[PDB]
Amino acid sequence: LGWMNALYFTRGLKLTGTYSIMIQKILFKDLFRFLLVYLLFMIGYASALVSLLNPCANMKVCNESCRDSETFSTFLLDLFKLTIGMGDLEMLSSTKYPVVFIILLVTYIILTFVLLLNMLIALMGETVGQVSKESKHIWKLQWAT
């Protein structure tokens, strides 16, 4: 916590504290609400997938480490490991294991991992251009305080 508070002094010389402006928007509003809505999305879809193994018979083919179970939440752990935008999950053709599960999985992960974070990246790129006077102004405001 003290090395966090080290930011308190890091808002004076050398134009330090510019982050202290943008954290006013990203931590409280933008990244906050984004992580909320995305967490809700992914937990809902997690319930979906853990319910979508009985038809499209129980199989969650090994990732690119939960096996078929019913315990309480190990599903969520291994499934989140799967949701990691890590390795461009496998493609299918002439399905043998769960058939309609895979298409839902791929379209969902494309929705959430090719648009949502990109939505937020574009949001950053557009919102950063708001600093007009609050550079010298917050500088002398630091002076004052």
Next chain:
Amino acid sequence: LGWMNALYFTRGLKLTGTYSIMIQKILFKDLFRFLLVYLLFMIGYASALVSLLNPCANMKVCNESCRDSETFSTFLLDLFKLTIGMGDLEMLSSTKYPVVFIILLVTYIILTFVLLLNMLIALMGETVGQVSKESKHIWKLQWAT
């Protein structure tokens, strides 16, 4: 689908629904046409490569899992796995396995995976600066509706 519709309420307070602006352009026009043209590119080049094993004798040297076959489309699966911009595919010198196949492969993947998505990234970076009045305007339009 209900958790998709959760975006319907997520367009009011806290300036939610900014995505609902950009999705007007990226989902229907930009990312759409880009994925279309890129899919066409890659499937054409896939036909090319699966036809380019007989001279430059049959060999698709193990990636950085289809072996020489003739079945129907396993080519497409393993080849797409190869097309994943995953690991900066191997370099060659003093060729022994297919000779002119590798140079075509590398120049194609450089074309499609160092320019096309970068073309679209620059397109994003330039198109995001269009919000002039439709922030407060779409806000009060949400109000109205």
